[PDB]
Structure formats: C-alpha cells, structure tokens
C-alpha cells in the first residue's frame, strides 16, 4: 500500500513462519538458516529482548510495529 501501517504487516507474516501469530526465536533462526550466515541462538535471544517490549516471551504485531523500524 504505502499509505501507513499496511507495509509492516506483510513483513510480520514474513517474520512469522508457522502462522502462530507472534515472532519467536524459533521463527528468527529459520530466517537465519535461509540466509546461510553464522547462526547464534544467544544473538537471537538479544533480538527477542528488543522485540518483546512487554516481556511476554513473544513478539506480537504491536511489539513488531516498533521492532520493524529497528530492522529493515
Ligand atoms: Ca510466529
Ligand atoms: Ca512480547
């Protein structure tokens, strides 16, 4: 779209893998495996702390809306 929130929502489905509705470290590591670069679970855990604003253990679309600005 390009009008406002519509573009990041396509990326949330891109970041989510099993259609669970949240972005999780298990989902982040699959993207790193597709990328073919060094994989570090502790690095993925640091990404979870930036992504999980409410410390609920999951990255939700609202947590992601702030998160997508951090990663483009
Ligand atoms: Ca997910
Ligand atoms: Ca969360």
UniProtKB/Swiss-Prot annotation:
GO CC annotation terms, alphabetical: cardiac Troponin complex; cytosol; sarcomere; troponin complex
Binding site for Ca(2+) 2: 16, 18, 20, 22, 27
Residues that bear Phosphoserine: 9
Ribonucleoprotein is among the record's keywords: no
One GO biological process term: muscle filament sliding
Effect listed in the UniProt record for changing residue 56 to E: In CMH13; increases calcium sensitivity of the myofilaments
GO molecular function: actin filament binding; calcium ion binding; calcium-dependent protein binding; protein homodimerization activity; troponin I binding; troponin T binding
Keyword Calcium attached: yes
Binding site for Ca(2+) 3: 52, 54, 56, 58, 63
The EF-hand domain, residue ranges: 3-38, 39-72
Keywords: Acetylation, Calcium, Cardiomyopathy, Disease variant, Metal-binding, Muscle protein, Phosphoprotein, Repeat
Annotated disorder: Cardiomyopathy, dilated, 1Z: A disorder characterized by ventricular dilation and impaired systolic function, resulting in congestive heart failure and arrhythmia. Patients are at risk of premature death.
Extra information: Cardiac muscle Tn-C can bind 3 calcium ions per molecule. Domain I does not bind calcium.
Stated role: Troponin is the central regulatory protein of striated muscle contraction. Tn consists of three components: Tn-I which is the inhibitor of actomyosin ATPase, Tn-T which contains the binding site for tropomyosin and Tn-C. The binding of calcium to Tn-C abolishes the inhibitory action of Tn on actin filaments.
Family per similarity comment: Belongs to the troponin C family.
Protein name: Troponin C, slow skeletal and cardiac muscles
Organism this protein belongs to: Homo sapiens (Human)
């Amino acid at each position: 779209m390009g009008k406002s929130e519509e573009e990041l929502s396509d990326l949330f489905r891109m970041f989510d893998k099993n259609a669970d509705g949240y972005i999780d470290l298990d989902e982040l590591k699959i993207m790193l495996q597709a990328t073919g670069e060094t994989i570090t679970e502790d690095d993925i855990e640091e990404l979870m702390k930036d992504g999980d604003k409410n410390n609920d253990g999951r990255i939700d679309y609202d947590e992601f809306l702030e998160f997508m600005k951090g990663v483009e």
